[PDB]
Structure 1
Amino acid sequence: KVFERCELARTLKRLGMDGYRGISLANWMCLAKWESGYNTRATNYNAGDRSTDYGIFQINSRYWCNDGKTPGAVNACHLSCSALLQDNIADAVACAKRVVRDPQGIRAWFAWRNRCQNRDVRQYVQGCGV
């Protein structure tokens, strides 16, 4: 599924993402936007380390989910990476929350640091009723 902006905004809110560990909805939207263009099926193989980025938040198999084909990786979210390819983003949201519970928080995503951090992100949730 390729979410429409406001549709996703409300979906994330309903899932408890607004202010989760201090992270506004706008920061989550900007993240998903840059990571997959709001696309739950998005995937990106990393030829360098044989890992893959799954779903709307592009969570990496090296540490976050298990896909079996990544040579001796880990699964901190304790989920099959396939769950990150569902139209229903509850499993992905659960994993995103697990990711940000670490020291760095949302900075785990390089794209957030580069395209969202210290930016005017109001536009991501404007008119969404969130």
Structure 2
Amino acid sequence: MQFTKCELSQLLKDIDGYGGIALPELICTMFHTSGYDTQAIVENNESTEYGLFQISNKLWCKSSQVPQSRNICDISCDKFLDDDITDDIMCAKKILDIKGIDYWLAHKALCTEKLEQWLC
């Protein structure tokens, strides 16, 4: 599923403030990693990040690439490529509670200040 920035801002209204993340920070990361496409994948040599929230199989979900993964979200990574971002949000909240905003922002400085362009 492909979303617009406004569609997605409405679906994610609830996660705003969760664990200290701001919705526009999220939308910034999403624009750059998926173009708001729930089927996006970003590959690294060892691991892969899936879907809108770019959730890694290194730790967070089960995938044949990384059979040793801790699978902290107790879910197949395939669920992060479907059209239902509900499970993705569940796992992103776990990420926020365990790792925090750094998961998305530590290496995406542009999405940590001057964020007016991400408002609907």
Common topology (TM > 0.5): yes
Once the two structures are TM-superposed, the CA of residue 102 in structure 1 deviates from its matched residue by 2.0
Partner of 2:110: 115
Q: How many residues align?
A: 120
What one-letter code is carried by the residue in structure 1 that aligns with 2:117? Q
Q: Write out per-residue CA displacement over residues 22-76 of structure 1, whole angstroms, 9 at most, x where no aligned residue.
A: 22211221121122111110012322x2x21110121110101111331412211
Q: CA RMSD in A?
A: 1.7
Contact 2:20 2:101 in 1 (8 A): no
In the alignment, the residues of structure 1 paired with residue 93 and residue 30 of structure 2 have an alpha-carbon distance, to the nearest angstrom, of 13
Once the two structures are TM-superposed, the CA of residue 112 in structure 1 deviates from its matched residue by 5.7
In the alignment, the residues of structure 2 paired with residue 31 and residue 102 of structure 1 have an alpha-carbon distance, to the nearest angstrom, of 19
Identity score, percent: 39
Unmatched 5+ stretches in structure 1: none
Task: Within 5 Å, give how 1:1-130 maps onto structure 2.
Answer: 1-13=1-13, 16-47=14-45, 49=46, 51-103=47-99, 105-109=100-104, 113-117=108-112, 119-125=113-119, 128=120
Q: Secondary structure at the match of 2:49?
A: strand
What one-letter code is carried by the residue in structure 2 that aligns with 1:81? C
Unmatched 5+ stretches in structure 2: none
In the alignment, the residues of structure 1 paired with residue 71 and residue 105 of structure 2 have an alpha-carbon distance, to the nearest angstrom, of 20
Once the two structures are TM-superposed, the CA of residue 115 in structure 1 deviates from its matched residue by 2.2
Q: Pick which of 87-96 and 26-35 moved more.
A: 26-35
In the alignment, the residues of structure 1 paired with residue 91 and residue 107 of structure 2 have an alpha-carbon distance, to the nearest angstrom, of 16
Which runs of at least 4 in structure 1 moved beyond 4 Å after TM superposition? Answer: none
Once the two structures are TM-superposed, the CA of residue 97 in structure 1 deviates from its matched residue by 1.0
What one-letter code is carried by the residue in structure 2 that aligns with 1:3? F
Check 1:9–1:95 CA distance in 2 against 1; reply closer, same or farther (3 A cut): same
In the alignment, the residues of structure 2 paired with residue 45 and residue 73 of structure 1 have an alpha-carbon distance, to the nearest angstrom, of 16
What is the TM-score normalised by the length of structure 2?
0.88
Once the two structures are TM-superposed, the CA of residue 89 in structure 1 deviates from its matched residue by 0.5
Contact 2:33 2:42 in 1 (8 A): no
Check 1:96–1:22 CA distance in 2 against 1; reply closer, same or farther (3 A cut): same
